[PDB]
Design a protein around this ligand. Structure first.
Ligand SMILES: [Cl-]
Length: 161
């Protein structure tokens, strides 16, 4: 629907604020599920960041792009991992999220979850095919990040799971 309309902007705002009723109302009025703001963020990026599981589900049910990339190359999965939202991480993977998507720095969701010490998110990403050898632009793997941060608990999950 159009290109950067105020209707799409209202849906982006309601998705970030977790306004479930307002999100259903706006969608019924024809708001585009894949509306983008100036940062290339979609309603699914903003709901995943702010940890609104229910809204993430309705967006997906109504055809939101699970692998949309913003201006920094961050996908909704990168954001759910970075903000520590485990249930959203699981729901996104079930709806075909690309476990090895790369942002502008070559970091995958695994790199971001390791950097923030999110152990269970790391474990879930590994069992969904996360690439342990993926190197970012600084030449680091998620394992290298865990070692540099002296998180031996995380490093052990990264080597054995
Ligand atoms: Cl969650």
């Amino acid at each position: 629907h159009h290109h950067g309309s105020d209707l799409g902007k209202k849906l982006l705002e309601a998705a970030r604020a977790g306004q479930d009723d307002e999100v259903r109302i706006l969608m019924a009025n024809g708001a585009d599920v894949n509306a983008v703001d100036e940062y290339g963020s979609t309603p699914l990026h903003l709901a995943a960041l702010a940890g609104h599981l229910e809204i993430v589900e309705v967006l997906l049910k109504n055809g939101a792009d699970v692998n949309a990339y913003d201006t920094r190359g961050l996908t909704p999965l990168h954001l759910a991992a970075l903000y520590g939202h485990l249930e959203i991480v699981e729901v996104l993977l079930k709806h075909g999220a690309d476990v090895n998507a790369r942002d502008r720095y070559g970091d995958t969701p695994l790199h971001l979850a390791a950097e923030l010490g999110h152990l269970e998110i790391v474990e879930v990403l590994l069992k969904n095919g996360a690439d342990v050898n993926a190197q970012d632009k600084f030449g680091k793997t998620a394992f290298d990040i865990s070692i540099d941060n002296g998180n031996e608990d995380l490093a052990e999950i990264l080597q054995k799971l």
